[model samples]
Target chain A: IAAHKGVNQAPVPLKMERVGPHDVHIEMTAQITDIEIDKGKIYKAWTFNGQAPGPLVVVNEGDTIHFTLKNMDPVVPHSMDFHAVHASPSKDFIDVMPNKSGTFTYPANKPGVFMYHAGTKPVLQHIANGMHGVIIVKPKNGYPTDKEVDREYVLIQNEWYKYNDMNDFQNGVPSYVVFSSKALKPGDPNTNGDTFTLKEKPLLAKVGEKIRLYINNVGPNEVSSFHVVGTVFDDVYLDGNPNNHLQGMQTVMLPASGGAVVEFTVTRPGTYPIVTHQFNHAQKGAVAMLKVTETGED
Target chain B: IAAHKGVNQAPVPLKMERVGPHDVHIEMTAQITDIEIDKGKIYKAWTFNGQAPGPLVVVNEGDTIHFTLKNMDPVVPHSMDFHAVHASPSKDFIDVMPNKSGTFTYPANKPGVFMYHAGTKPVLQHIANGMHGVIIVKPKNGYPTDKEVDREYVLIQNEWYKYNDMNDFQNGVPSYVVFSSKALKPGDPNTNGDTFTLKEKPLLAKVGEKIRLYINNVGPNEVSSFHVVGTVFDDVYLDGNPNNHLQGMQTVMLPASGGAVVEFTVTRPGTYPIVTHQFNHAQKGAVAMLKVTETGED
Candidate 1:
């Protein structure tokens, strides 16, 4: 049998920071669907408006975000659970049922960067099948807003696990299935294929200007140390809206399912490092560059 | 088979720092021996004078160190080497056979903390077997004599590997052996047969005293950030003798075969947690405490 098709469907746009002088106004959307490299095919999941990574939602800490999730697939029930939004009810927000529609509003009270995913049943399969997106909530006070950012960027670190259990009626794979690292080693075309690589390489930061870095790990595993070289950052705003930059040069640590934001003033222009402090991720695909140039305006 | 019992020996004592009120006089000995631990046994090493970490050698900067190294053990040919002494001939004064001895005097020219070991033939096995000690050469002006330090201590971070071979010698069991997580699961121990656990309790320090610390690493495998909790040290003297107590704090960066001397004033009284900065070591063990008291000493 051939792999599924039509993975990249809709372009769901999201906000970054409130309109501030010189702030980056990024209007972007991420596709939330699966691409099976083993079979050289892509498949779209029943997702938020028919896309994987749901919808890329961005907002400022104090400014509330108005999330509009719409179901577009008839085979799979689709719902949105914003990791940026705190759970009002003491339950996993798996609301949308099969062949149905769902909607949700996420107030960007909590800041820093985060992610959103399908809340429908069998969430594991939804994520594994390509139903996830990044949501960055900025600090409400709005940073200093000036000095020309040579480049600002975001890095999303994730681990992909794919299993083919053919069944039309079943939701996703069992949530309790034991995951083995062997399934995701570099050479596995289908499970850890080439498409995932090309899709992630474009997210690099610019150099020379001050950098506002937001690192989020959507993986079900690994603590990530979002680190940079060639500069020292002092302002480490943890679990709070990063109103100002990190106070000093310190290696901020992130726990699994957690994240960190550090703003560093890049003085010496160079191709510095952006890596997971966890060493191995830097070895894995979890590494990128903050190419600081005397050029490039943010 | 039983481990080798090194020639029962006495260590040569070289007083490191003296003269200035701020100086720390450490007496060290150069020796040769073997160290290891059986599957279910305490760490044991045949050392010079039966000292596990060798002798403490101290000296004042500018002041000459009258180092007298005499071979006491008649079983093996031995020689002394001072990592701190860097003249044309850097290794221990010279090789001394049984009953033979030598004296190498170096003006504790450069300061900070350093290591001295048996530099004769089979240097690797000698160091691996516990024939090494630390050297703390004080600065010329001596410590900040104006600052009163009630307590001072040193923590040498290191790792060891065990093998059935002693006569069949190899320099070291390289650290490149990647760890298999399966081998580290819950109850299973690493090759060391020991899950590195800091010997929970260590010596304590008194409160309200300026505690100057000298740290050294004799690593066959890893590096360590010897940090104490509850206090931010103001100044650190890198590979330099901290005798004058330096006008500023330096970053203590120790690599293989190197060490550092740092000084800090602890005005408050309390129990400070001391540990290795490396996450793995901190997680496993290598933790101790510095107990501070209004009255009394560490």
Candidate 2:
């Protein structure tokens, strides 16, 4: 469970669901399907349970999620917000037309790393036609820098496009700005694409341990400066609220439905990457890679 | 000076320069005129001494700047990249061809609110053709939330485009995303152009005074969620480091060359837009209002 183990295979797996330590029922269904982009060509998306980053439920901080939503998009209409729930987004995230179905509960009581898109109504084409993800309330008692972390992962960061044109969501120019859960240092086959194609799941570390990550930038428009090329964030949490901490920092700006919680300490094993240094949104494909091995191999 | 007397002015004037208490100097040159864009008309920029966000060089933290640069563009080539200086972009920010002139020396030993563009060589069309600005440093021992700030302003948030076609600078659809200096709720002659006008000089403030802003996005691209609709940020300081504080945030993403130092206290007065809550980069003009009165009238 290195947070869904090494590269390749994460249409949904940053899982940490404890089912119900106090009631957490969750159940989504919005489907439209397709995915894959860093290497381009697949597209389509709308997801929520059919994937496009629509799974990782995990609840804790006051638990109560008992949520539910169904849509199958037979004609457009999907809903459910939840930036760490407090409800009332139009009366507990309304919508749900299309194939219909809706129920609510939420109240996770906010703890950290939020973001859970698809608030329906053209909301940027249902969050850029891919809904969204990432939401780890967890502060029921953890993260006080939680024993200095030794391993933990849960990245998200989005930014992919092709359709929209209100100046491409107000000039955010992107074809890929990834990190949809798997792939990190594996290019080729997307041919002339110049960058992005992370399929090796390198997020497996141990060069002095202490990793912790949990970024989230569901950017329905692009704005993440995440960065990690050679490491430097000794700590950061703005949206992951361990009391909105920060330190040293070389890059961390993330707004577009932001969320962060970095932590470093690789100190020597190679392959880092994990960018968005805004280098044209890390050269179209917001990268990912993190090898580091003194024996934390996969 | 409510930051250069708001609305219609400010091609430069967020001043706070106490100048030379230990040797400051400055001197710029670069050149290439035009400016004005939230009402979209005059384009071609790339300046330095001739305007376009190339002034406001204020210092403090351990002083000693003596900087200098001169290029005048007889054919292209210009440099000076200080994201708050630490020196050496190639050994103290080199380049100065096409008419030549250089002369470095900085120290301001890290305070905050940085961003100082153009490191030459296509660095994104020399910072998207307008160069960049903002770099306050201060903090030699000031901000401990210093007297909780009574008034202060220094904003900069950019993202405008027209030329270039590498997917228009990689998926960034921005036609404006302003706040280069002025404009905050004026809209009327930008006719077919919907928002942005700001020429009545808002930004006054007093309803319970506290203000203290110093945002900075520099974005040779785009990524600022820096909001302030009605008011909430009781404090934020990410890049304006005062130990990088933060508290109960609502929006503060910044990252395209990030910087922050919020603070709020309006409660109930009048005008108060100051946006980028990414609403398509605040309806194409990134907004800016902040009038708030109770006797802060100008």
Q: Write the per-residue lDDT of candidate 2 for residues B1-298, one digit (tens) a residue.
A: 1221222322332223246676676767776665566554766566776565566565776676777787766667788866665433444566888678888875555677777877654466677766777767778776677797777776677776774445565544777777745222243111111135442555576888887787778777767788888778888878887888878687887778787888888878788888888788777777867788889785
Q: Any idea how many clashes model 1 has?
A: 48
Worst 10 residues of 1 chain B by lDDT: B175-184
Candidate 2 C-alpha RMSD relative to the actual structure: 23.1
List iRMS for all predictions: 15.8, 10.9
TM-score for candidate 2, residues paired by index: 0.34
What does candidate 1's lDDT look like per residue over B1-298, in tens digits? 2323433343343345454553333334334333233224444453555554565555555655556656655555566666766554545356666666676655556767777667756576666555665667666565554265555666565444454345433543321111100111233211221222223233444555666666776653455444444333444555644432322211233465567656655445555545443323433334455556667443
Candidate 2 whole-model C-alpha lDDT, 0 to 1: 0.67
Docking verdict class for candidate 1: incorrect
Count the clashes in each prediction. 48, 20
Quote the lDDT for B298 in model 2.
Answer: 57
Runs in model 1 deviating more than 4 A are A1-283, A289-298, B1-46, B90-92, B142-150, B163-201, B206-210, B240-252, B263-271, B282-285, B293-298
